């Protein structure tokens, strides 16, 4: 099951403007909760979440850079999962970034 969100690159906090069912089911947060949150998805952060990984994802968004970052995330129920976050900038003809697609894959459980 694919898990992904789409972020608005033209607002300061890169707000989530779409999230698919797979993503919501993965992390245990409903679409209503996820929508309009910064697409870094800090609400998934917990004890094992590496500062360096979080920083690297944030960097990719700032610099509109395509990048895969593997990071420990937490579902609503507290379970930890190692997640490969795939940051994909989508630019127009001019070269401006219009949105980001972020894909999430579970690497392994806990």
Residue numbers in the entry: 26 to 135
Sentences from the paper on this structure:
The KCNH family of voltage gated potassium channels includes the EAG (ether-a-go-go) channels, the ERG (eag related gene) channels and the ELK (eag like K+) channels; these channels have roles in cardiac repolarization, neuronal excitability, cell differentiation and tumor growth. A defining characteristic of KCNH channels is their large N- and C-terminal cytoplasmic regions. The N-terminus typically includes a Per-Arnt-Sim (PAS) domain, while the C-terminal region includes a domain that strongly resembles cyclic nucleotide binding domains, but which has been shown to have little affinity for cyclic nucleotides. As already stated, the role of PAS domains in KCNH channels is unknown; it is not known if these domains bind small ligands or mediate interactions between the channel and other proteins.
